[PDB]
Amino acid sequence: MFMINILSLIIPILLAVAFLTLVERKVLGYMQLRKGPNVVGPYGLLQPIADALKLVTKEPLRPGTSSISMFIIAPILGLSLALTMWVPLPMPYPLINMNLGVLFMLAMSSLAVYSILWSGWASNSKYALIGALRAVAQTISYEVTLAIILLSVLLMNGSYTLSTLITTQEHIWMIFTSWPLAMMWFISTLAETNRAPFDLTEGESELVSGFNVEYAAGPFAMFFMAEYANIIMMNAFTAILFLGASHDPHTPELYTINFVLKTLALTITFLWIRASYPRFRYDQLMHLLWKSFLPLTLALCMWHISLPIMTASIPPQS
């Protein structure tokens, strides 16, 4: 039965990724006075299937200068991390219930930077390596703000347990208590998934596709699935962290509906950023992180350590 739980978690997530491709294309199209996929199936509903089928029957050109061991290990690591990021998530009850769930997510997402450091190195070409190094530096630099923002927010939670976030946000959203940290967290999440003006590793008009140039068909498809799973997962984490839904122990379907709707709204906002802004330069986003986000994050961590102590509002640790 637990195996069935794992399967009924993984497979719907991959399906949601597949149709997130369609949803993103349609949202971009309608923001651009066009339609997007509306021919292949009703309202493009069979388009993700067409993409998945075409990709797995397309020739996966592997580079002659590629260390194939890591060339295939990188997609495995990426997709395995992208899937395992959902196992502690408290759609009302988690698959895996840990004391340190958000710490587990921080660690697992920090292991995901290897899939770029290994793909760029394995692909050789002597230039995709530079794009991979830029991506890794961006990822590790925004890990700092992710970690510190999570630390400051959880000082109202009292623990690293994600189920406790539901209890913490019973009467009020955590957004009303930490909105500046919410904006910085949301932009950090944007930057970590290489999205929006932070998509420097796959700049369509900067370096064509960067670290993913040599990957084609199948491994490219799995990398794409990993990225979109990470996008939906990060938006789910954001919804649980800042927009906690009311929970009825006798009707958890209500919480699930609430959470899914809020996660979809945040994902649609992620696609909304993509259609509205130009692209940051690499040094420009590094400057943003290091000289704008980091000082405010340090100050707000200070503030959120001081605040529960000076108001006798320290949460329980149980």
């Binding site: 008009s205 130009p278 690499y282 420009q284």
Partner: protein, 388 residues
């Protein structure tokens, strides 16, 4: 250990503005020199023109700056008419100015939206390419072709406007400023767009003059110079408009100049619509402009002149001219040599993009790799006229 990355490639790159090989060495992150390698769209246009009659050479100019077709053919027509010592009729001149400003709108839409798309703002491209499609419809309604009209000819224009065209041009123009507003609502004040354009590709006014720059690349640096005002052609002296002038000579100032030029193009188009005069649309001299088909099928002289103009062409008196117009991309000119026959002896085409791209190395000094994409976009470059 000096291993400055010599990435000497990028033609297939989507931001290469078509076909461009860039030879680049970087001192780490920043550009040390740019070496544009052009000729990937050199089709021998200037040699082919020597084998073409004067009428036969006109369609070659549609395909030089294939974003500003009617402006190129206007420049060529002005040169040939100057050599012929003939004058196009007033209605033809007003039509030429109106469609030159429509063409400037088309070119500026393409330039600004592709610049933004290269930077990473893809959305304004589609909104404005719908307006571009409508102006393509105007082109096709006047000439039968969406892009390469071949409509403006030495002597005037090919045929008159169809009934109801001015009404549709008025309907389009009365709504276009709202689209410029929406384009500015996404770019002008955006802290990311300005971060990618402010103080990027700064060129000194004197250094802009000495490098042969023209148009927005001049007025971006504050130089008060516009061919439509200083050296007016057609009926441009009878139309009122403003010349937007920059102050910092960077990509952002040039972008603002192009947007305000779109607004002033709308302003000119309004007067062209309101002041279109009656009359013929080609010079009433059948030894230069072909007669009406009805006269060709009825009158002996008209038939003879139709035959000769469409087989031999008109003879142009011997001489050479350099005539230039204020094209949407800068000063577009031609040095046209005539030996007295019906074919040009020599036709050198002056394209502003040639001199502008010659200055890419200078303007990219001490800038990152992502800034060169912006600097190419701000020099708006069509390699059909760079390479000819």
């Amino acid at each position: 250990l000096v291993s400055n990355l010599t990435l000497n490639f990028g033609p297939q790159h989507p931001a290469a503005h078509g076909v461009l090989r860039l030879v680049m060495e970087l001192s780490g992150e920043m550009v040390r020199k740019c070496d544009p390698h052009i000729g990937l769209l050199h089709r021998g246009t200037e040699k082919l023109i020597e084998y073409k009659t004067y009428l036969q050479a006109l369609p070659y100019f549609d395909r030089l700056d294939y974003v500003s077709m009617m402006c190129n053919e206007q420049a060529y027509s002005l040169a040939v008419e100057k050599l012929l010592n003939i004058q196009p009729p007033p209605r033809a001149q007003w039509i030429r100015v109106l469609f030159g400003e429509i063409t400037r709108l088309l070119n500026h839409i393409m330039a600004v939206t592709t610049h933004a798309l290269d930077i990473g703002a893809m959305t304004p491209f589609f909104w404005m390419f719908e307006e571009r499609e409508k102006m393509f419809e105007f082109y096709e309604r006047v000439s039968g072709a969406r892009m390469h009209a071949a409509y403006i000819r030495p002597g005037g224009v090919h045929q008159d406007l169809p009934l109801g065209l001015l009404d549709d041009i008025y309907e389009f123009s009365k709504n276009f400023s709202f689209r410029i507003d929406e384009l500015e609502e996404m770019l002008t004040n955006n802290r990311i767009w300005r971060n990618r354009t402010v103080d990027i590709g700064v060129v000194t006014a004197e250094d802009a003059l000495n490098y042969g720059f023209s148009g927005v690349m001049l007025r971006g640096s504050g130089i008060q110079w516009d061919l439509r005002k200083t050296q007016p052609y057609d009926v441009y002296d009878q139309v009122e408009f403003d010349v937007p002038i920059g102050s910092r000579g960077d990509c952002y100032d040039r972008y603002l100049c192009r947007v305000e030029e779109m607004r002033q193009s709308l302003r000119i188009i309004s007067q062209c619509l309101n002041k279109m005069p009656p009359g013929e649309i080609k010079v009433d001299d059948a030894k230069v402009s072909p007669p009406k088909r009805a006269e060709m099928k009825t009158s002996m002289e008209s038939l003879i002149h139709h035959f000769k103009l469409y087989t031999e062409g008109y003879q142009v008196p011997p001489g050479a001219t350099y005539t230039a117009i204020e094209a949407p991309k800068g000063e577009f000119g031609v040095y046209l040599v005539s030996d007295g026959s019906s074919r040009p002896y020599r036709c050198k085409i002056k394209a502003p993009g040639f001199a502008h791209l010659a200055g890419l190395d200078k303007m990219s000094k001490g800038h990152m790799l992502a800034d060169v994409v912006a600097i190419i976009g701000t020099q708006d470059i069509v390699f059909g006229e760079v390479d000819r």
